[PDB]
Nucleic acid binder design. Structure first.
Lengths: 50, 17, 125, 36, 59, 59, 50, 252, 38
RNA sequence: UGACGGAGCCAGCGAGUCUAACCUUGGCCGAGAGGUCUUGGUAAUCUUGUGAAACUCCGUCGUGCUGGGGAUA
């Protein structure tokens, strides 16, 4: 059960990164936001979808 | 003298074999 | 997609390929800038294609040179030949022919070995 | 089982050089300070 | 194998040029994407390979 | 060739002789080398290997 | 091969020297993928695969 | 267990009395123990000398012997911070890098280098690419075989780089450990040599004590990467100078 | 010996010169490393 | 035009399953042949590709030759 839990949390993280990449390549204006560490995020322009 | 004892020992061991 | 131009400069076994295209004005030899070309006493041999015609010709174009082979002085002669005839070919193809042959006249009045090497030798007397 | 239930319900090492871990010297407290 | 020199093979005709493709150093996306199946499928792959090499060596 | 002779005088005595490897590669001894004493320079039909033995058939 | 290099005849045009190209050292680039595929795939293809 | 009896003391005494007078070994000044293990110790011979810690006898101080130090590519950091520290500023006879070492020393220069130094110490990141640079004279046998040192007390994690610094107190501490202790190299067969003691820097009870120290550290069960390699019954001990016969001890 | 390594050897006080010659006379007990001297 | 000590850099030749030392010290196994380990000395234009040296830069010195038994620590 513990290794089922480890497999599930690793799959959740890799699907989360995959979903962020897919969300990133759709469309709209965005900028690369960099934090203190280097964990980058993408902040999207306040503009609703036509 | 123990030096010459042990080197004669390995010598005659090889000679006996 | 960009207007670009490729030329070649040769001395003994050095050879330098210069790509000239439109840009902001950066002149780069082997990735490093032109102001790093050693042996540092022939840096003005490299510079004279720029100083003979003015930097206002180079203010709108960016050159890059890749130099292989040869030695130190053969490489600076390949660099200056490649830069000179690349500027001439760019002003031929994408700027006017009057500036083209003004550049050819200036380089040929300084030395035509900026534009034409001395290539096949000896003489069998 | 208590640690496994808490999880389910909540010496040098160079990576490139595996010979370092038998390689390097066992330094002591008597080696770092005094007159040589 | 026959190791033809680079000075010769850069100066070859267009018909005689030697198609030598470089190895890949980058973990490309299609290779990191593509799925392989396991268990019964990998032993099926092993079986088909053994059968095909026994057939080729017998021939 | 290393050790079939003990001296450059011996190789000088035997210059020009035809030798061969055990592969049947024919050869000829040419000149004694200077500093290693019984070592000499031979020329063969083609490139012999490091796993060979040369042979001077005498009577 | 050395004799063919001596007798190249540099006025040698083929139609395949539009598609085929040459690296920096002068040798032949052989694309290791396909030649019935494409190495770079489009944005909507990447959207579907991702 | 305990190895100090009249057989061992008589053998070691007779070896010293032989090497004082014999005109065939008046240059080699050293005592080695040959351990004949029972089984074949399985680990193959890399040329990395593991360190056997003696407990109460420093057999060498780091200032009474020539030390060559081999460093990484740029070498300016290690050379400056080692030579103007005054904890280590006089400890190394030479500090070079691998690039200019193999540039300078080719051929018989390596024989002069061998005869010049007596402790070769390399950065552990360059220790593996030494057997071509230093040739086979340093790796046939083991008396100038180079030691690994860590120069920085810093560990490499994945996805990130070792910050390039060096620590002179740490490197003096591990050269002190290296000269203070003795060393061995594991191999496949059942023969294993360990240097113990010198010919006039030492005496019979201290040489016998560090012989027993190497025995304990070698056939120990713990300390298993560095020292616990004798898995079976250690069968025989011998003592010899490099051109002297194997005087036997502890025939089990 | 604490003498400055840029002074010319003429201007040497006798305690500095005797410190120099004492160190060079008995190098071992001043723990000079044995590779400096042959 | 030097001597030490660091640093920057620039070639063209050359690709046969082929390329390459010697003498020892000992331990163990084996009937022997030998195998394997261990060890010190000597020799060296290294080994297949990366790389040359002269050159360039930066600190330091400072320009009146060579010998063995004798004799001072």
């Amino acid at each position: 059960v513990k290794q089922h839990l480890q497999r599930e949390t690793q799959l959740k993280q890799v699907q989360q990164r995959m979903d962020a990449q897919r969300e990133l390549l759709k469309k709209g204006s965005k900028k690369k936001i960099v934090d203190s560490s280097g964990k980058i995020s993408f902040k999207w322009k306040k503009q609703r979808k036509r | 003298d123990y030096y010459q004892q042990v080197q004669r020992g390995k010598q005659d061991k090889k000679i006996s074999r | 997609a960009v207007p670009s131009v490729q030329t070649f400069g040769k001395k003994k076994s050095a050879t330098a390929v210069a790509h000239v295209k439109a840009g902001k004005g950066l002149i780069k030899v082997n990735g490093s800038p032109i102001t790093l070309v050693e042996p540092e006493i022939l840096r003005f041999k490299v510079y004279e294609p720029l100083l003979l015609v003015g930097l206002d010709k180079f203010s709108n174009i960016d050159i890059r040179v890749r130099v292989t082979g040869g030695g130190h002085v053969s490489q600076v002669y390949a660099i200056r030949q490649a830069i000179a005839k690349g500027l001439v070919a760019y002003h031929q193809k994408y700027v006017d022919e009057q500036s083209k042959n003004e550049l050819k006249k200036a380089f040929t009045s300084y030395d035509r070995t900026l534009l034409i090497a001395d290539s096949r030798r000896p003489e069998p007397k | 089982l208590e640690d496994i239930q808490q999880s389910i319900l909540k010496f040098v090492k160079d990576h490139r050089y595996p010979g370092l871990t038998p390689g390097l010297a066992p330094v002591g407290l008597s080696d770092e300070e005094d007159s040589s | 194998g026959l190791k033809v020199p680079k000075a010769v093979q850069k100066e070859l005709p267009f018909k005689s040029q030697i198609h030598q493709m470089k190895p890949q150093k980058k973990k490309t996306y299609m290779a990191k994407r593509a799925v392989v199946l396991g268990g019964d499928e990998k032993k099926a792959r092993s079986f088909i390979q053994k059968v095909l090499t026994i057939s080729k060596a017998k021939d | 060739i290393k050790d079939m002779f003990s001296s450059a005088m011996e190789v000088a005595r035997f210059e020009g002789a035809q030798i061969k490897t055990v592969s049947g590669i024919r050869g000829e001894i040419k000149r004694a080398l200077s500093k290693p004493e019984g070592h000499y320079r031979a020329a063969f039909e083609d490139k012999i290997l490091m796993s060979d033995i040369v042979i001077l058939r005498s009577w | 091969l050395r004799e063919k290099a001596k007798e190249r005849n540099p006025d040698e045009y083929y139609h395949a020297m539009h598609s085929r190209k040459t690296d920096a050292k002068g040798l032949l680039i052989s694309s290791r993928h396909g030649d019935e595929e494409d190495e770079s795939l489009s944005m909507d293809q990447v959207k579907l695969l991702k | 267990d305990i190895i100090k009896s009249g057989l061992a003391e008589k053998a070691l005494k007779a070896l010293i009395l032989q090497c004082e007078e014999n005109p065939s070994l008046k240059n080699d000044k050293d005592i080695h123990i040959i351990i004949n293990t029972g089984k074949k110790m399985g680990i193959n011979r890399d040329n990395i000398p593991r360190i056997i810690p003696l407990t109460k006898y420093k057999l060498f101080k780091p200032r009474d012997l020539n030390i060559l130090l081999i460093t990484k590519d740029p070498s300016a950091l290690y050379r400056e911070t080692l030579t103007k520290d005054e904890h280590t500023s006089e400890l190394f006879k030479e500090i070079i890098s691998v690039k200019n070492l193999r540039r300078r020393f080719k051929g018989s220069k390596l024989t002069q280098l061998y005869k010049d130094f007596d402790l070769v110490v390399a950065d552990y990141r360059v220790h593996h690419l030494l057997p071509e640079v230093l040739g086979s004279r340093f790796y046939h046998g083991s008396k100038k075989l180079p030691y690994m040192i860590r120069m920085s007390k810093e560990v490499k994690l994945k996805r990130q780089q070792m910050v390039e610094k060096c620590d002179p107190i740490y490197v003096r501490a591990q050269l002190r450990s290296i000269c203070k202790n003795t060393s061995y190299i594991p191999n496949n067969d059942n023969c294993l040599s360990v240097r113990v003691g010198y010919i006039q820097k030492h005496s019979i009870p201290e040489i016998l004590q560090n012989i027993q120290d190497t025995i304990n550290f070698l056939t120990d069960k713990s300390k298993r990467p560095q020292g616990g390699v004798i898995k079976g019954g250690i069968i025989s001990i011998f003592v010899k100078t490099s051109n002297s016969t194997s005087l036997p001890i502890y025939q089990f | 010996a604490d003498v400055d390594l840029h002074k010319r050897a003429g201007e040497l006080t006798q305690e500095e010169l005797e410190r120099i010659v004492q160190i060079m006379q008995n190098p071992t007990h001043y723990k000079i490393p044995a590779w400096f001297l042959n």
